[PDB]
From TrEMBL, chains A, B:
Keywords: Chromophore, Luminescence, Photoprotein. It comes from the Eukaryota. Belongs to the GFP family. GO terms for biological process: bioluminescence; generation of precursor metabolites and energy. This is Green fluorescent protein. The keyword Thylakoid does not apply. InterPro entries: GFP (IPR009017), GFP-related (IPR011584), Green_fluorescent_prot (IPR000786).
Length: 226, 226
């Protein structure tokens, strides 16, 4: 039945499941929401299901479904992420926090029934006990970023690079350098893109009636040439 | 709390009208949408009614209703903006773009019937034709910022300061230094706040089916103690 970008023409439910271990602190996060790739929008709510998150919510934003990007008409032949569905893709990252520790993640993003599911394993290491991460000095907010994409022909996939700017409580900015690769899970045809980028913007919020450690997350993402 | 704050317990329709003249290039913008102060959320659509906008949409974001900020229960005594309603307030700014020109604006924000209305006059001068504003070199996106508020006792109102970070197409960032004053229109008592700030986050988007020059704008804002 439906395949590739066909799976994204309406509103699609989303489920995110993360198991993390950072500097030995183990934790899990579950998210649910929906995505609307026609407008490049999604909304998610995340709960730390193991109690208190041991790292700031903003550090996990990138780890916690780029298949919901709006690709303008002229760029449809360059949308790798939807082309891999429903069987999906593996997304692996290494993330370095400036003057501090690193995250390493591996995720499978694929359809399970009618839901787009992102299941992730993450390990963090080398963090300073009173750095911005373990010391909880990051502002609860997020900025706009460009996500650069190119074909990785040997893996029949893509390589992705960008840097996140995290606002720190003292008015400084800490960079988190991201290195990412995506490879299809299935063996069917996928679209291997010309070099381009995703213009990504987000906002983090809270439900003042929710008592659990949580994050309400809004994202707007559109692909663009160059 | 304040009497005016009770006007914001639901979803309030918004109308925005702006006339601008930047280096002699004149334009008007009309906006409509709704605000939800309980969650600190705004959604607005803006249309350049004079045709094509001669400056980047991002430069107009701050000019184009901080009465929609979520003030947590323990900070409701510091919400000047809602307290001045429904009579409203005058909001004046000067905005200095780094190594470039300045905007000056004067707005009246008040209720007209059921609708919160923001009507603004904006003048921009001294811009470089090859700078990021007149040369239209700003990316179509927006970042998170802290908006710092303090009482201006002599004016029975508040002074507000913040620096916006505008992402530029070459990867640089251009600051826009905002200086702002708000003064009640009405005679009623208003809340004069302790020093605090608004955590503000935004995202700019497009409706692919809208052919007029326009901006779909989403904002999330919550007051926080210093």
């Amino acid at each position: 039945m439906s395949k590739g970008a066909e799976l994204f023409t309406g509103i699609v439910p989303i489920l995110i499941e993360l198991n993390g271990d950072v500097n030995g602190h183990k934790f899990s996060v579950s998210g649910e929401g929906e995505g609307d790739a026609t407008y490049g929008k999604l909304t998610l709510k995340f709960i730390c299901t193991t109690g208190k998150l041991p790292v700031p919510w903003p550090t996990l934003v990138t780890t916690l479904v780029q298949c919901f990007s709006r690709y303008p008409d002229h760029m449809k032949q360059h949308d790798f992420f939807k082309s891999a569905m429903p069987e999906g893709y593996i997304q692996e990252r290494t993330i370095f926090f400036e003057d501090d520790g690193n995250y390493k993640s591996r995720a499978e993003v694929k359809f399970e029934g009618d839901t787009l599911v992102n299941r992730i394993e993450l390990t963090g290491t080398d963090f300073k006990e009173d750095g911005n991460i373990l010391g909880n000095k990051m502002e609860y907010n997020y900025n706009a970023h460009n996500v650069y994409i190119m074909t990785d022909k040997a893996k029949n996939g893509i390589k992705v690079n960008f840097k996140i700017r995290h606002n720190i409580e003292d008015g400084s900015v800490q960079l988190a350098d991201h290195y990412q690769q995506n490879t299809p899970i299935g063996d069917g045809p996928v679209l291997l893109p010309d070099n381009h980028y995703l213009s990504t913007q987000s906002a983090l919020s809270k439900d003042p009636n929710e008592k659990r450690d949580h994050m309400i997350y809004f994202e707007f993402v559109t692909a663009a040439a160059i």
